[model samples]
Target: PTNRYYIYFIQTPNENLVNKKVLLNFDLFPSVSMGRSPENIVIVPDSEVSRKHAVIYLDNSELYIEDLNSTNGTYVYDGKQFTPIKGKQKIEPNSIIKLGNQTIVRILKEWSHPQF
Candidate 1:
């Protein structure tokens, strides 16, 4: 029941942080800027990915994803297909987002360690 947010990279052109869940700090950073540039909070090391590829913004505690005019654009998975998203895309606590052409990110409500 703890409130927390995380972004996980399931797949990406580069292997950086793949399968690692990165926690988000709303108090420190209200928005997540992901891109190839080092200035981004989530730095992707892809050539074609825009310097400001995408941004995940927190609006009134609601999260939304926006493509910053990426060369190939951003996509969202709706159970079956990875469809292109236009403008600001409001996401569920659990949703899949595709950046540019290669990276696949998942929005998580909370991360828990499994017990066997």
Candidate 2:
């Protein structure tokens, strides 16, 4: 990856769930597809910690993910620790992944070429 962008799950005071994922939704630019890059997207799983960290990067023509020392931790599949997945992380369809302290999240990947 040439540049990096990130989104974090933050704990809100009023929410009963403890924490929620916050994504960086950038402003769209006109006349071109500005937000079609991978650096603009991020994945966050629901959990108690509400503050799981994820980063996307290109390594040797492959993409990879890394943990940023989250409080509750992030799990990939089979209810086990995901060792900073690399090379196209396989997200199970219709699976609710656990992040932080049991914060569950469903995966939603949408590939769109936004016409700005």
Candidate 3:
């Protein structure tokens, strides 16, 4: 069997990269920060978005999202209600992730198979 990895395709609604795709490989980084700061891998330049808004990481084969103690908070829509991501929430593919007020990102999952 080959080691499997996940690829995250983030869709930002309002930004320079609007409708543009941002890909994150789970095998590459342990965690990725999304915020207004330039240091963050995902940057949202909105006012409601905090400097360090949220953190997205890969745990085992599952993907998790957490709020970074932001003032506006991070939310995830589970096809029913939009619940705030307090600690670490398990995220699914095609889920809608909201950062603050205006920044909306869509999560896409892709499986990878390592070749020997």
Model 2 Cα lDDT, one tens digit per residue, 14-96: 25423543322223311111111233244332334334354434345333344455555555555554333333454433333
Residue 72 miss distance in model 3 (angstroms): 0.5
Clashes of each: 0, 8, 0
Taking all chains together, the TM-score of candidate 2 against the true structure is 0.36
Superposition error at 93 for model 1 (Å): 1.2
What do the candidate models score in CA lDDT, each in turn? 0.84, 0.37, 0.74
Clashes of 3: 0
Q: For candidate 1, what is the lDDT?
A: 0.84
lDDT of 3 by residue, 2-106 (tens): 433232325444546667667775556678888888889777777788999898887887789989899988898877877887587998776788888877788
Model 3 alpha-carbon miss at residue 75, Å: 0.6
Instruction: Please name the candidate that would achieve the greatest lDDT relative to the true structure.
Output: 1
Residue ranges of candidate 1 with Cα displaced over 4 Å: 111-116
Model 3, position 56, has a per-residue lDDT of 85
Sort order, TM-score high to low:
1, 3, 2
- Scored against the true structure, residue 43 in model 2 reaches a CA lDDT of 32
Ranking by lDDT: 1, 3, 2
Tens-place lDDT per residue, model 1, 1-116, is 24678888888777657888988777688798899999999888777688999988789868899989899888999999999887878998889988877788899986454454
